[PDB]
UniProtKB/TrEMBL annotation:
Pfam families: LolA_like. This is Uncharacterized protein TP-0789 domain-containing protein. Gene3D superfamilies: Lipoprotein localisation LolA/LolB/LppX (2.50.20.10). It comes from the Bacteria. Residues 55-240 form the Uncharacterized protein TP-0789 domain. Keywords: Signal.
Length: 240
């Protein structure tokens, strides 16, 4: 058995879970740093695009609290490595649109434990090399242990990611992220999964940055698939 080919084959199966053309969801994010808490409420709109409908466009609209109300992120995430993912943010305080590109992708997303790059396609299969390490029972759940390393030349802050993948739903249960100095930079917990409109979806996450002394908890609700979203939500004009 080839663990590199087996790792890639699993990554492909994982990428087949999302059979939707578009989706809508609502989320609340709570960021904890030394007992101090920041909160954000947002709606996410997503729709598939491209020749084979493999590109994914997303619009993230913040509504609460008052200081972040009106912040919008537009993401044009492309299948393949030929074109870098496009990302823009509309900032309500300066009524400006700013492109997030290059190393800006590694910066914090809305002061959370997520980076701007964490907001793009989590399952871009051909951006990585895989290694299936085996199986392990994690708190009563049977998982595959799947390591993925970014291919040479990929713009990312991570050197490698260890993923615990549920054998039954093919959703991640946990993942460890490593920086360019091989240090553990982030711990992800996919703490809740739900079958929504026939698609097993992560609907709760805890993201920890052990080096920052902070953790983010995100709760998704009112998630729906194939609602018939217009292309207007994903145009550069939807920002300003
Ligand atoms: Cl700019």
């Amino acid at each position: 058995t080839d663990p590199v080919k087996a790792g890639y084959d699993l990554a492909v199966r994982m990428d087949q879970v999302d059979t939707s053309q578009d989706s809508y969801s609502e989320a609340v994010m709570s960021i904890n740093r030394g007992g101090k808490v920041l909160t954000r409420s947002f709606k996410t709109y997503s729709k598939h695009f491209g020749k084979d409908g493999k590109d994914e466009y997303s619009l993230i609209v913040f509504d609460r609290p008052a200081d972040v109300n009106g912040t919008k992120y537009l993401v044009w995430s492309y299948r393949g490595l030929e074109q870098d993912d496009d990302m823009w943010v509309y900032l309500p305080a300066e009524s400006l649109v700013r492109r997030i590109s290059g190393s800006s992708k590694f910066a914090s997303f809305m002061r959370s434990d997520l980076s701007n790059e964490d907001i793009q396609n989590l399952d871009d299969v051909d951006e990585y090399d895989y290694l299936l390490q085996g199986e392990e029972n994690v708190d009563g759940i049977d998982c595959y242990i799947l390591e993925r390393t970014p291919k040479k030349g990929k713009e990312t802050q991570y050197s490698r990611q260890v993923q615990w993948v549920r054998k039954d739903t093919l959703l991640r249960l946990r993942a460890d992220y490593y920086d360019k100095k091989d240090r553990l930079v982030k711990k992800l917990f996919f703490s809740r999964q739900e079958k929504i409109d026939g698609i097993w979806t992560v609907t709760q996450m805890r993201v920890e940055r052990p080096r920052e002394g902070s953790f983010t908890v995100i709760d998704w609700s009112n998630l729906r698939y194939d609602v018939g979203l217009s292309d207007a939500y994903f145009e550069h004009s939807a920002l300003q």
